């Protein structure tokens, strides 16, 4: 319902896309515990909604998210960290079944960068900037900064970025495979919506098998990933939407999915 | 035998390349059971031919393969699929020990795209297009689409492709690493045959060991992939061609290999 | 000490960067046992040196290294290789805690390419050329040319390089993610040192944990990698530098790391 | 809260053990939503209670848990199962960071057995029986039943148990290492508490890491397990309870752990 | 067909079990290429036969199989082996979707023991002996004898068996978990048939999934193995036999499975 | 050299076994640095000695190794363990190419138990006891005692031993697969030497390959485990000893292996 760190609203034609704007520009959308709490509540209600098929995540023109809130972390001990399982809440984004598109304008550093990488797709603004400056303040990134980055971008660029704290541009991010489309700043959010919209017009149950199938590519060997894929593939033949979509092509007419 | 769906021919210098062309242009080379049946026969003849050192696979100038034959899948049940090991036959291509180069002009969609990714090397034409549009017909890619794509191009672009069914250009695929060379439509097939000629000049057995070692990059941690590679490496030192290859270099002369 | 195959000097402000220059130019820095033996000695004293934070490894302007010494390999048998654990001494470079940057001008072929790929970051000169031509001498890459290359560059290009022995430009290399920056031949080594310089001013302990985390991306599933990253992340909180880094940030001043 | 399917109470001298007893004897502690929901609340509490060092899970004397509530699963569709993750909340045992010990008297069938296997340590009564009989009612085990059983017991016996639904005694389970102790029915829960009470004596933080390290053995290669273990083994030196544990030993006395 | 090396017959009440008896006693069922071709033939027709729900593989009373045929392997070079993919044809048994039970009487040495380990369940006779004696003829086991054995029995005993060639008894093997039952010599095969009979009572499709799930235990981390298990579990809710099976339990009657 | 903590000498038929006896009985063979240093020198020597084919490691009748040495460890900080790569030198055992057998009489606790488990084979005297009591002094095992133990013995017993520090008997260890023989105390060492003699009379090169194939069971999936095994299986066909073994068999005579 009511939110003070973010702005969540349904968007697209037929409102089939849920947009989540991080709205804490004063500290460039720095990711405190209360901010994350609210994104999780927001994600939950969009996951729960039957009309919603794809979620789009963004911040402002200047920043997607500058990073973790450093003023909270400052006095933590080792024991405090391990016992509490600090940054457990931050992983929620990777357990949503419906797909999430990151629309990243301006700065995505540290947590913000890590948040974008947890998403399934990233669209970048022209003046978007990606970095993992943790090393500069005596830590390493602790939310897949080392894992998801390196897998996208390759060892040499990940090592360079993680060990120096250096930033890369949206153009390089695209070239390296971290992001998959570059858009003007003014139309970025809209272009992500139109993509989210396309995905939303496909069957929710099958779309979720697809997403799950693509995430197995980082969790197992190709041989077993192939096998797992074949079983999700076979599974689709137990859905109505799969008979609908395939007989639509053969009849040369428009398909209509009931997410079933 | 005598094919109805494909053209299999020896090409290159001294006919050391096996060219398989998918020749079902009325259906945009849609990969029906009968066509894969023949493709697999051609693959087996060239595997057994001591003359042949590498294989190039193509379709027409308009289409490589537009997909699986959606008219055949229309009335499959979940039981039909599981107990038929449906699409298993499509994997014979992954068991070929000689290198296979895919020369993709025009459309390589869905099944067609997957066939391309199973090959060791992909060359694309200027107007080539890749897509996994199974999501539009209410399935997911069921022949490595999600696995090989994601491993080649990174999450963002694979998620966008599989979830929306969108197409990427020849040039989008080169930048992503899905393909390794772009050619003029008119010379693609010849450029691929030249690449196959080179490979064929090398020792078949050490070439087989190299391909096996490269494929292992997706089946193992790096530590064990490194251990596997050494076993193959040391193994080469039991071949006549290794001795000849290194003696050629020391005597400043051309190597003349004997597949042994 | 007094090496004959290499030069080793401390560089950067306050001699915080170790530079190793392969100096066997008459043989294009071909990696004979003697040379690798000196390389490892030099890595050891830099690794043991508390002033040094980073290591830059380079060759000549014409050649980084043109491969493993083929004359030493020529008369080896299978039994010689296996029992002598041939090439095992090369791996010492993968075991150094501190970051190593390759600065590649000219040829990096076969073992030379493999040596570069074992470093964390690769910087390339505008005329650098990468290749794995082992197949042309009747062997396969035996020091991770099929493992690390594939993981960087993708299957297609890797297969094409490994099976044909063909070379790729510095520009190709960067595009494929094998290298993270290209520079002019003239200033490569100085720009590599500058990168090393930044890294070396960060906490040596947390930097080492950072690197150990990024390398984990090739040794485990993303799930376990994430868990490993967290364990290391929490571990930083037991260090003096991690407090000194964050407190320096908050107070808006220079952090003063004591590598502890 | 005042539970209706279970009993949850603190036990041992100084009440340092959590005991959860499944109390649905009429249905032979068959697992239904209502029972699982409460078990999960009881785990949550004991995990939060700083006096609780270990948990014991048990049933009655005739039955630990005799399978699941099949009357609930009876009308379910495939879609219903997948969309609404079925048996998701049956998994919180695998997320408790303190050690849980199954104390199995009588039948542990279907989910019963799975529930026991999800625990760290299984103690079995003399007349205890284990089976995965889901095959007989047209399913397969869906709570790690094929996965944890096989890794405990081995392929032959796991395959025999799963494909026939046949039952093994406590004596067979012990031989095969599914359970690690056999006790008289009368004193089973009593032995389980004594074992739990020793575990409760140790440092809560250091016990937690030891647990995570053992669990690692089923999720990584031996190579990386060893690395992970080492890193946790280094972590212990950040804690007071290790400084305290070792200095108590060298001073020849009993140690006072503060779970820190 | 007209098998010269084996005997294949349907067995059990209702002929729902297929028996394959290796019948080359003059060579102690040594596994020459001819014998394996026929074994593979028999497996295929029992795999295709809809009445057959489980297979039993045996040899004679003196010998299950004494190993790979050492007279055939004698004159093979390294080149021959690698290029001929030697022993690759043995793996077809691992591709059968129906369960296979090895009934081992007397000698199961080297390849004999490897073949039995490829089966899903092993029943051993009181006088059976297991060994991997390849080392005493200057090879290692090359059909899973280092891999399955180790996984069943543990490092210490595997290392002992493979490095010395020493044999173990049925009792040793049961203790180690290589075999799940010991039978008298004279009723072993019938006892095995009775295990097959029970397996054949259940739904062939759900049994195929069950078997496929248990095999996954050796190919994945426990985390991925559970998600694969969950997906197969859900898949069963798409079959006739699971509703029938569950509705038959609730109604306290005998289920009638349709393998569907 | 002139050892002060160990006794090293050649034993067995023709002095082909290398015996390392830990000889610090009054400290129950606690694994201090001086002793591990010497151990490693002794491994290096027997590994280089072409007379030696296998190694037996032991302590005295009352103790194999009571563990590590808390005095050394008492003041270690977190930073000092990580920076100094603590217990790195304790791993050299896992890098010997020749087989190592442990002959464990009496106490093998903590570091002593890990040291045993690092060996290929464990033989235990009738009064042997195994334990991992690190938890009682506030650490976890740091030398694979959470990893090798769990793989050998199963989760329940592993969790029990590590979380309580409780001993198990020699008889319990064999039941669980941690050790492969139990011997009378007085003849233990001689039985281990007999087992070593057998190994030493086989081909060293093929023995080493076999040990490698077995060690791989814990480093990859069974699919890739099998492929690695095949590559080693073929490589033996490059050796003289394989031809000699198979020919010996064919000519009804004793093989005479030459280590080649
Ligand atoms: C020529 C051959 C055959 C002999 O092999 P070498 O390895 O001993 O000598 P190089 O091929 O490396 O040649 C030395 C030098 O002469 C050159 N050379 C050799 N033969 C010719 C010819 N025929 N024409 C022009 N240049 C030649 C060769 O390219 C070289 O110039 P660079 O490229 O600047 O190093
Ligand atoms: C190889 C290529 C690629 C580079 O060609 P170049 O024509 O620029 O240089 P050369 O191949 O002719 O060789 C240069 C020099 O280094 C030597 N070299 C180059 N690569 C190796 C390797 N890999 N091993 C040993 N020696 C090597 C080569 O033999 C030459 O020495 P000589 O014995 O005096 O002719
Ligand atoms: Mg090389
Ligand atoms: Mg790339
Ligand atoms: Mg066991
Ligand atoms: Mg054999």
C78: nearest CA in chain E?
E78
Measured distance CA(B56)–CA(D42) in Å, rounded = 63
List chain E residues with CB under 8 Å of C223. Answer: 221, 223
Measured distance CA(C119)–CA(C56) in Å, rounded = 9
CB contact under 8 A, A175 and C179: no
- Superfamily covering domain D1-202: 2-enoyl-CoA Hydratase; Chain A, domain 1 (3.90.226.10)
What single string gives the DSSP state of each residue in chain D? ---SSEEEEEESGGG-EEEEEE--GGGTT-B-HHHHHHHHHHHHHHHH-TT--EEEEE--SSEEEE-B-HHHHTT--HHHHHHTTTT-GGGGGGG-SS-EEEEE-SEEETHHHHHHHTSSEEEEETT-EEE-GGGGGT----SSHHHHHHHHH-HHHHHHHHHH---EEHHHHHHTTSSSEEE-GGGHHHHHHHHHHHHHHS-HHHHHHHHHHHHGGGTS-HHHHHHHHHHHHHHGGGSHHHHHHHHHHHTTS-------
The answer to whether E229 touches E174, Cβ cutoff 8 Å, is no
Parallel, antiparallel or unpaired: strands D129-131 and D168-169: antiparallel
Query: Is C9 a catalytic site residue?
Result: no
DSSP helix/strand/coil, C8: strand
Does any ligand 2 atom lie closer than 6 A to the CB of residue C66?
yes
Residues 6+ apart with CB under 8 A from F229: E140, E141, E142, E144, E145, E146, E147, F213, F216
Measured distance CA(A4)–CA(F248) in Å, rounded = 84
Q: Does the beta carbon of C95 lie under 8 angstroms from any beta carbon of chain F?
A: no
Measured distance CA(A56)–CA(A197) in Å, rounded = 10
Hey, how many other C-beta atoms are within 10 angstroms of the C-beta on E190? 13
Question: Nearest CB to F220: which of B220, B235, B238?
Answer: B220
Q: Does the beta carbon of B219 lie under 8 angstroms from any beta carbon of chain C?
A: no
**Alpha-carbon distance values, F113 to A188, D164, D184, D242, F94 (Å):** 60, 39, 31, 20, 14
Among F159, F173, F216, the residue to mutate for chain D (most D Cβ within 10 A): F159
A220: nearest CA in chain F?
F221
Instruction: Select from D94, D104, D83, D92 the least CA-distant residue to D35.
Output: D92
| Integer Rg of chain D from CA | 19
Residues annotated within the binding site of B for substrate are 68-71, 111
Q: Topology of E203-259 in CATH?
A: Lyase 2-enoyl-coa Hydratase; Chain  A, domain 2 (1.10.12)
B48: exposed, middle or buried (C-beta count within 10 Å: 0-12, 13-18, 19+)? exposed
Q: Does the beta carbon of D223 lie under 8 angstroms from any beta carbon of chain B?
A: yes
The answer to whether A18 touches A8, Cβ cutoff 8 Å, is yes
E184: exposed, middle or buried (C-beta count within 10 Å: 0-12, 13-18, 19+)? exposed
List chain C residues with CB under 8 Å of F208. Answer: 82-83
Protein residue with its CA nearest to atom 2 in ligand 2:
C66
Return the biggest CA–CA distance within chain A. 66
Residues annotated within the binding site of F are 68-71, 111
The answer to whether D129 touches D122, Cβ cutoff 8 Å, is no
E240 among annotated binding-site residues: no
List chain E residues with CB under 8 Å of D148. Answer: 222
| CA quadruple D219, D225, D227, D232: dihedral sign | positive
Adjacent-strand bridge partners of F101:
F56, F121
Q: What angle do CA A128, A133, A137 make, to 5 degrees?
A: 150
* CATH 3.90.226.10 domain locations along chain C: 1-202
DSSP helix/strand/coil, F56: strand
Provide φ and ψ at E192, rounded to 5°: -65, -45
Measured distance CA(A112)–CA(A63) in Å, rounded = 9
Question: Nearest CB to E206: which of D74, D87, D140?
Answer: D140
Adjacent-strand bridge partners of C168:
C130
Residues 6+ apart with CB under 8 A from A146: A140, A158, A162, C210, C213, C214, C216, C217, C225, C229
Query: Is A111 a catalytic site residue?
Result: yes
Give how far D177 is from chain F: nearest CA, Å.
6
Measured distance CA(C236)–CA(C242) in Å, rounded = 6
B253: exposed, middle or buried (C-beta count within 10 Å: 0-12, 13-18, 19+)? exposed
**Buried-state track F238-253, b at ≥16 Cβ within 10 A, e below 16:** bbebbbbbbbbbeeee
User: Which tokens in the block code for residue E125?
Assistant: 């006779």
Residues 6+ apart with CB under 8 A from B243: C74, C138
Measured distance CA(B211)–CA(B225) in Å, rounded = 13
B94: exposed, middle or buried (C-beta count within 10 Å: 0-12, 13-18, 19+)? middle
Instruction: Select from D72, F178, A197 the least CA-distant residue to E154.
Output: F178
* CATH 1.10.12.10 domain locations along chain B: 203-259
* Helix ranges restricted to H, E51-147: 70-73, 78-84, 111-118
List chain C residues with CB under 8 Å of F260. Answer: 79
Q: In what order do the strands lie in the sheet with F63-65?
A: F63-65, F107-109, F129-131, F168-169
**Alpha-carbon distance values, F150 to A156, D156, D218, E95 (Å):** 36, 20, 9, 30
Instruction: Select from B90, B143, B146, B86 the least CA-distant residue to B114.
Output: B143
Structure letter (DSSP) for residue F95: G
Measured distance CA(D243)–CA(D227) in Å, rounded = 22
Measured distance CA(F141)–CA(D44) in Å, rounded = 28
DSSP helix/strand/coil, E90: helix
Active-site amino acid positions of D? 68, 111, 114, 134
Measured distance CA(B1)–CA(B10) in Å, rounded = 15
Provide φ and ψ at C67, rounded to 5°: 140, -170
Parallel, antiparallel or unpaired: strands B100-104 and B54-58: parallel
Does any ligand 2 atom lie closer than 6 A to the CB of residue C74?
no
Does any ligand 2 atom lie closer than 6 A to the CB of residue C30?
yes
**Alpha-carbon distance values, D91 to A198, D38, D103, D117, E103 (Å):** 35, 13, 18, 11, 38
Question: Nearest CB to A158: which of C214, C223, C247?
Answer: C214
The answer to whether D35 touches D20, Cβ cutoff 8 Å, is no
D200 CB-side CA count, 13 A: 28
The answer to whether D30 touches D63, Cβ cutoff 8 Å, is no
Question: Nearest CB to A250: which of B74, B141, B148?
Answer: B74
Experimental method: X-ray
CB contact under 8 A, C78 and F208: no
User: Which tokens in the block code for residue E81?
Assistant: 């082996």
**Alpha-carbon distance values, C118 to B227, C54, F126 (Å):** 15, 15, 49
Query: Is C111 a catalytic site residue?
Result: yes
Cα of C41 from ligand 6 centre, angstroms = 45
The answer to whether A80 touches A86, Cβ cutoff 8 Å, is yes
DSSP helix/strand/coil, C46: helix
Deposited resolution, Å: 2.5
Return the biggest CA–CA distance within chain F. 66
Measured distance CA(A196)–CA(A207) in Å, rounded = 12
DSSP helix/strand/coil, C222: helix
Hey, how many other C-beta atoms are within 10 angstroms of the C-beta on C253? 9
């Amino acid at each position: 319902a009511n939110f003070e760190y973010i702005i969540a609203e349904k968007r697209g034609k037929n409102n089939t896309v849920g947009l989540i704007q991080l709205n804490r520009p004063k500290a460039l959308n720095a990711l405190c515990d209360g901010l994350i709490d609210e994104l999780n509540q927001a994600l939950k209600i969009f996951e729960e909604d039957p009309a919603v098929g794809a979620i789009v995540l963004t911040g402002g023109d200047k920043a997607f998210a500058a990073g973790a809130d450093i003023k909270e972390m400052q006095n933590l001990s080792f024991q405090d960290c391990y016992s509490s399982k600090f940054l457990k809440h931050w992983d929620h984004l990777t357990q949503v079944k419906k797909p999430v598109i990151a629309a990243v304008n301006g700065y995505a550093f540290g947590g913000g960068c890590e948040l974008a990488m947890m998403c399934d797709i990233i669209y970048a603004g022209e003046k978007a900037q990606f970095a993992q400056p943790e090393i500069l303040i005596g830590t390493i990134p602790g939310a897949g900064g080392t894992q998801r980055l390196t897998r996208a971008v390759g060892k040499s660029l990940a090592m360079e970025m993680v060990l120096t704290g250096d930033r890369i541009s949206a153009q390089d991010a695209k070239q390296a495979g971290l992001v998959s489309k570059i858009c003007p700043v003014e139309t970025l959010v809209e272009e992500a919506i139109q993509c989210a919209e396309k995905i939303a017009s496909n069957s929710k149950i099958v779309v979720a098998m697809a997403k799950e199938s693509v995430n197995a590519a980082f969790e197992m060997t190709l041989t077993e990933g192939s096998k797992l894929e074949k079983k999700l593939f076979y599974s689709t033949f137990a859905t109505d939407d799969r008979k609908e979509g395939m007989t639509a092509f053969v009849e040369k007419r428009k398909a209509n999915f009931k997410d079933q």
